[PDB]
Design a protein around this ligand. Sequence first.
Ligand SMILES: NC(=O)c1ccc[n+]([C@@H]2O[C@H](COP(=O)([O-])OP(=O)(O)OC[C@H]3O[C@@H](n4cnc5c(N)ncnc54)[C@H](O)[C@@H]3O)[C@@H](O)[C@H]2O)c1
Ligand SMILES: NC(=O)c1ccc[n+]([C@@H]2O[C@H](COP(=O)([O-])OP(=O)(O)OC[C@H]3O[C@@H](n4cnc5c(N)ncnc54)[C@H](O)[C@@H]3O)[C@@H](O)[C@H]2O)c1
Ligand SMILES: NC(=O)c1ccc[n+]([C@@H]2O[C@H](COP(=O)([O-])OP(=O)(O)OC[C@H]3O[C@@H](n4cnc5c(N)ncnc54)[C@H](O)[C@@H]3O)[C@@H](O)[C@H]2O)c1
Ligand SMILES: NC(=O)c1ccc[n+]([C@@H]2O[C@H](COP(=O)([O-])OP(=O)(O)OC[C@H]3O[C@@H](n4cnc5c(N)ncnc54)[C@H](O)[C@@H]3O)[C@@H](O)[C@H]2O)c1
Ligand SMILES: O=P([O-])([O-])O
Ligand SMILES: O=P([O-])([O-])O
Ligand SMILES: O=P([O-])([O-])O
Ligand SMILES: O=P([O-])([O-])O
Lengths: 419, 421, 422, 422
Amino acid sequence: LKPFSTGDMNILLLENVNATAIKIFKDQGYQVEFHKSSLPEDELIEKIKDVHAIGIRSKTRLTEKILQHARNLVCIGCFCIGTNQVDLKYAASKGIAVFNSPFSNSRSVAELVIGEIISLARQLGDRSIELHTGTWNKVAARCWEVRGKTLGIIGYGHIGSQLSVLAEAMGLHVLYYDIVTIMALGTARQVSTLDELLNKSDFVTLHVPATPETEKMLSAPQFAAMKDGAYVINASRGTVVDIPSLIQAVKANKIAGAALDVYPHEPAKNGEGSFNDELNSWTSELVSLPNIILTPHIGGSTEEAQSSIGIEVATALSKYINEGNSVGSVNFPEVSLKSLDYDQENTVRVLYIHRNVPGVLKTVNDILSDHNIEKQFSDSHGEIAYLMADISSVNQSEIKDIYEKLNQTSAKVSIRLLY
Amino acid sequence: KALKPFSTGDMNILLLENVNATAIKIFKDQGYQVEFHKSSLPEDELIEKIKDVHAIGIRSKTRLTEKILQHARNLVCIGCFCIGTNQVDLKYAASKGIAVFNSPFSNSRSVAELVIGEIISLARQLGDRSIELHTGTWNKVAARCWEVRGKTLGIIGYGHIGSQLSVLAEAMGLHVLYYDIVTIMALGTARQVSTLDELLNKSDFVTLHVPATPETEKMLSAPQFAAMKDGAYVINASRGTVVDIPSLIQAVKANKIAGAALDVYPHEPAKNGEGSFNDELNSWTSELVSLPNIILTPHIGGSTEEAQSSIGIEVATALSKYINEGNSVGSVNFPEVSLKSLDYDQENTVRVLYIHRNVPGVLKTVNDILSDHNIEKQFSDSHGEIAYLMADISSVNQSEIKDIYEKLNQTSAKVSIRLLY
Amino acid sequence: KQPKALKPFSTGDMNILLLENVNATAIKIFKDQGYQVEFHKSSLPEDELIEKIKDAIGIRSKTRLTEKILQHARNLVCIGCFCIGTNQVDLKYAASKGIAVFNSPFSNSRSVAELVIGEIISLARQLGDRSIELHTGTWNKVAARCWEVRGKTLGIIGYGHIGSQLSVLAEAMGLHVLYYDIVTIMALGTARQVSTLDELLNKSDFVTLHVPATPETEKMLSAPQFAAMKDGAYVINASRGTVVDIPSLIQAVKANKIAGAALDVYPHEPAKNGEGSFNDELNSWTSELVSLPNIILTPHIGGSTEEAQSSIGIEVATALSKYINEGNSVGSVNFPEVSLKSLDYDQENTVRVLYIHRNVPGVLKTVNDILSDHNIEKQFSDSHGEIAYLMADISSVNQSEIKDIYEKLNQTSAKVSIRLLY
Amino acid sequence: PKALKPFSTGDMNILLLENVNATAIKIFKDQGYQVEFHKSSLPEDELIEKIKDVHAIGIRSKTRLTEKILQHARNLVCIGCFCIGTNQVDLKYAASKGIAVFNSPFSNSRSVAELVIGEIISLARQLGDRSIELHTGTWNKVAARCWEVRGKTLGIIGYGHIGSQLSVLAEAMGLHVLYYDIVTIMALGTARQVSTLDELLNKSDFVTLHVPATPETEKMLSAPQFAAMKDGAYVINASRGTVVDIPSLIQAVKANKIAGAALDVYPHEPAKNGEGSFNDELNSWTSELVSLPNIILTPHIGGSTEEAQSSIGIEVATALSKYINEGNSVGSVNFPEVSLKSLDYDQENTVRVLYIHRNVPGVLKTVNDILSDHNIEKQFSDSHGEIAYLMADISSVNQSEIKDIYEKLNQTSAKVSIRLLY
Ligand SMILES: NC(=O)c1ccc[n+]([C@@H]2O[C@H](COP(=O)([O-])OP(=O)(O)OC[C@H]3O[C@@H](n4cnc5c(N)ncnc54)[C@H](O)[C@@H]3O)[C@@H](O)[C@H]2O)c1
Ligand SMILES: NC(=O)c1ccc[n+]([C@@H]2O[C@H](COP(=O)([O-])OP(=O)(O)OC[C@H]3O[C@@H](n4cnc5c(N)ncnc54)[C@H](O)[C@@H]3O)[C@@H](O)[C@H]2O)c1
Ligand SMILES: NC(=O)c1ccc[n+]([C@@H]2O[C@H](COP(=O)([O-])OP(=O)(O)OC[C@H]3O[C@@H](n4cnc5c(N)ncnc54)[C@H](O)[C@@H]3O)[C@@H](O)[C@H]2O)c1
Ligand SMILES: NC(=O)c1ccc[n+]([C@@H]2O[C@H](COP(=O)([O-])OP(=O)(O)OC[C@H]3O[C@@H](n4cnc5c(N)ncnc54)[C@H](O)[C@@H]3O)[C@@H](O)[C@H]2O)c1
Ligand SMILES: O=P([O-])([O-])O
Ligand SMILES: O=P([O-])([O-])O
Ligand SMILES: O=P([O-])([O-])O
Ligand SMILES: O=P([O-])([O-])O
């Protein structure tokens, strides 16, 4: 049904990507160099020269200094959520598409919150520390059944919706405040003001992205705006909660418990003493506080999650390496074609990345005036632009000429022809 | 025309060891004098306060034995706001015609939700990881940390807690299988298993929801563990004897069981203490705490406000229904007897509540006495050496009720008699 | 648990006759407990009926039982109406002679609901009339006033067994459910109980009746009520043949006020199946009724499914077996509802007394005097009018004692029947 | 800051010709159009006169629009078939004049699904026969081989738009769902995809067809296959008039192998409604078929509901509005599917070119030279046959410059239709 291209390139994977990425690459038929740890600037630069696609994680640092030397690279796949460890503006300038999987931790974050809602309601965390050190304190005051309480979801997005149905299944009443009017799922209610959600809610979760409107969204003023004995959970971004204000609020018995998965300063390496007061001045005060579940950014750290993120991003790079499909790139125009589901043979695909200056399409379509262009799609994501064209009857003698003509043009950034 | 005055303060009820307020609402809305205490009272103060009380509501702390109930006259029923009839001398209470009630199934959702939470904590290892960040260590690990969706939960006891656990677990995206000595109509998408071993083979999480029986003691031992999937999880919030704790610590250290969560233990302390959960209680305490992914709780399954509130509602209505209509269904130590309230349309119908010794000829005695009026309904049953009779007699005259009461009170082998009108 | 073994041995032989084609599951239950069963496919005549009855009867509303045919019937224990209604059977006399009557009224609950669901869709899409048309060669493909069921509102009158089951089905199909009932009944699913019947009619597209036959319900949907529901709505009656004023409905349907209707019961129904039964001689409007668009007529088939009949067999056979073997009589129509625990193989030499008497004072004085020699563990009696029923479990009894006890009890004044279990 | 502003006239003109749902008028009027509505299909003469300046014409299954009657249309842009099929369109002609054709093929999913649930329940209970019987005066109250639908199993052949909706509804009524589809499709609810059609037929009590017309589906269910079904099961076909071997079926029902069946589509359906169209002349088997018991016949109405025409209106009007206003041609029957982002009004100096041309080399050389004076932000061209469609967004343009840009593009060789939108 669908034709492939050349198909014999070389990819380097750096920080332990799921084997499902490996199956997709190898079953696609590529050469794959796997590494278990994060490499230093020197060994990486030497290894990137003849590499074609690199799959990095949040630790490996890719900058213009180390990316200047990579001249045979096509696309960079971040098997991550975050993109800031890659110099997007430069990679766009050199015509390299970057891909990621931003919504892969959805079910993994929902299930975590549910467990943290129940554990905080029952103080299960405190109880396990207590029996571990030999103390047995069986109290039932302020221990609740989750059923019949109300859950306030802040940000009704990918994580927010999945959480909302689950909390309904557990028998909680769901309220969500969102800047956008979003069709509520199940029995939830869209609220008009944030104050109404906070006032009426027993549990409050944060599932918003990082914006200045969300920075310290819940601070000491915001905390007091809420139910008499309540709980707060933040598993979005380390700036949404005023942690000094929060430790103040928790010590005053205003918030019954809380569970946090993200902090303002997280360390970059696992260590036996990493989570100390040196990163956060308040760490000792929090640890000495009751019924708080502290976690090291594990919201999306599940086996099932990593397998899904691996498949998705590897499939994305595979489709971009084999077809021109760039949809989902962070720093690139989103461009795609029928990829020849009915097309016959002797058909070439032009993938022309250029600088977005007028007349570029004039030069190119003139170069192509000799053969029929069946489909064409070009879009511009800033200073760089991307063109795809399918020409209908080319011979190996002609394909050579077509490439050099395209290579000699002004504002060529990258040129490829798929056979 | 006839018509009778209100007696307030006629009944006097005593509630000990902090019974939930739903109980006081149920009692006061009916109108009683209720002496509430937040603690368990001393031997002197109790006997002083119990002589003329009419109904006592206690919990597992208050000890009511033959010595303290001997002096108590004009007592009607004892309400254990408990699961167990802990520290009540039932045989003596029955002997003096005292009904004891409790609410054994009020902790069902509170135990189910706990299990659901513990399944998630073990799968994500939230317990060990939250301890680590609390102690300054940072280990963000994702290997053998699973999403619950798509796994299977093996429920060992498909009773009140078992069924409730099942629907919740399916809602979370688990496949549920349950093994039970009884075939039980599956709820929802659950699957009844043929042998326990099939469950052990096929399950990723296994929970225990059985009672304490000789068949259940150390129900999960080393053969059972090896018959479970490589790296599965175990939860027991049923009874402290159901799991072979040494066998389990052996299996987990051998990396055959990934983690487990326990709410009940073989030797739990009888009083709260600052260093109570020590090795003196259980020889394995040091070995257990050392394992990597173990979630331990102090018999907290079901220690929730909603659980206690339901216990109050259930036991307070039960005692109220016994005091007002003689209805004893559900008593722990008593015959279970009950009759249709009354229709109110027919007047001058009295109801006899005759508690007697279970000896032949008594029913001859009573029905002769009642031979003057028509007995529309009658029901008597025997539970031990004691028996209980309730009857509705028709067209009785206020002059006659006193006579019928006096004749009945003078009978042989009557332990307590009461007439409603 | 328990063994729950106990076998009734006073006479030692009983023979029950299940006629008018009772479902085969009723035959299995009776035979498997061990009885003689005389099976008949039809309803018998008075002469053949009176004979064979001396040496349990199962009827099907067709069989006519009056005091006359039961006076001669001796050694009778219980009558099982494998019916919903126990009508044209003389309940009061059978009680007078101490004969318990049983039935199964809620076994057709799922069959009637599924019907209405079926009748809702077809009225909306006019499937019936369209099929008549194609059968005679006419082809009229019209889409006007044919609706999707999803999004409409169903007015359920009476929220009982059928009303309940119908409600979840109506929603699952995507209908909004509104229901009117004289009693406040906790809605199932998303349904809403309405205040006034007039409210229900006003907002409803389909109205079904699922109420019993009472003077309050007779012709309860008449010309005012039809004028109250929305223009073009639909009327369904599968409850009782008196609840709809057919003249009022037929007036409305001719006036294009009501789009269609489906009727499963009528004021005057035939007593036998026939080729020309449904005529004006049976019901004055019958000719005008049939000459109307989109009317679904059915011959009291609401409860006529194989599954319903099998369910009717299991229920009533189980009830008769329980009354015969343990005496549990709960659910009898004309009898006191009395029952006691199983008994047990463990408790040996424990007899059960089943004593039916006239509801007159002093019977228990007489009876309990007789039993004074042995201990009564449990005893229960209740009265359903002039007749009353007593159950007793006696301990430490021997067949030597049992004979005297039956002899003494059979000799009592105003005692009507005596039975022993062993 | 110049902010040049146009005039408002009655120039915008839309023509709706035969039986359009009221939702198109609302969508068109609320968008701000002049709409000429007609209740019937007009003759060639009246049509030609009315189409000359129509920006947009909407026809139905009746209206005949051909190249000859389309020659006169000059200011015409798109033809919207408020249909499932585009049979009377003459697509090649519309393409030649650069006219896009639209339709709504999947609107009838819930209407045909609901019909099936009703027809399943009606066959199970033999409602059609019973209602014919009472109308003809006969009263036959039979329950034998009449079933509750709950607990039986439904076999779905074709799990597409209709099959999927049907599966959920059938489960709601208490059925087990099995489906055979040539493509492995993710089952909905508790359904199971079965491997072979033969597996499906053996275990099923009800069989439904929801497949397209293919040589693989033509006479898909024939006599070998019917004999491969449960003894005394049911057959439903509301897909295509070619999928069932009607003689094979009539054989099986007369052989008491198939208890009943319901058909909505046939090999030879009339093109016009008639009082005698469906005679033996139309289908050789018609007389034998109609004489068979428990068969539900319907005249290709599985999608003839008000809700269906309302949904069709919303869909096709929305599609035409998008082509007129934004150029999005996705879903056209005879046209390339081309679309670009909605164009945030915030950038107020960008033109949109909708350039329809002949699919020959050098066109994009010619065009992008013309547009070379300004930056083309986005561009998208695709080709359907000999015609092609270009959309381009060119930046920082002034009303002064637009005249040239339109003039040059209108002046190009092999330009068939050009439109600029800002
Ligand atoms: N803990 C973890 O390890 C982990 C894992 C995955 C995602 N996350 C974080 O969780 C967050 C949610 O992820 P997602 O996939 O749900 O994103 P999302 O973009 O689908 O949803 C975010 C939602 O928040 C809403 N929103 C934004 N600002 C808001 C505000 N001020 N008030 C109310 N609503 C607001 C947006 O409208 C949007 O619907 C992101 O910040 C993501 O980085 C954390
Ligand atoms: N953790 C807590 O603090 C807490 C609170 C309340 C109840 N519980 C305990 O939980 C247990 C279950 O409570 P419940 O309400 O479900 O009781 P239950 O009587 O409702 O259910 C027990 C079930 O176990 C089944 N069963 C019996 N023996 C079995 C065996 N050997 N193997 C498997 N199944 C067997 C029975 O058939 C029954 O279905 C009890 O022991 C109860 O005291 C614990
Ligand atoms: N078509 C058949 O063959 C067939 C089969 C079975 C049952 N039925 C009939 O259907 C009817 C309903 O049966 P059911 O088992 O649900 O009975 P039901 O007793 O369970 O329910 C009847 C309900 O109607 C309500 N009601 C009574 N009078 C009312 C009034 N005036 N207005 C509104 N609501 C009123 C009652 O409160 C009750 O909830 C019965 O009459 C039954 O005989 C017909
Ligand atoms: N009765 C009516 O008036 C009416 C109305 C609308 C649609 N229909 C017809 O119903 C049919 C289904 O419509 P839809 O919207 O579901 O279409 P669809 O394309 O969504 O679904 C058709 C399904 O059939 C499957 N399939 C195709 N050929 C098959 C074969 N030989 N065997 C098994 N499976 C096969 C396809 O994979 C697909 O799942 C169409 O033919 C349509 O014309 C009839
Ligand atoms: O008491 P009595 O005899 O039953 O009336
Ligand atoms: O008298 P009695 O038998 O013991 O009850
Ligand atoms: O290439 P083309 O010119 O579009 O056809
Ligand atoms: O040529 P351009 O417009 O830049 O794409």
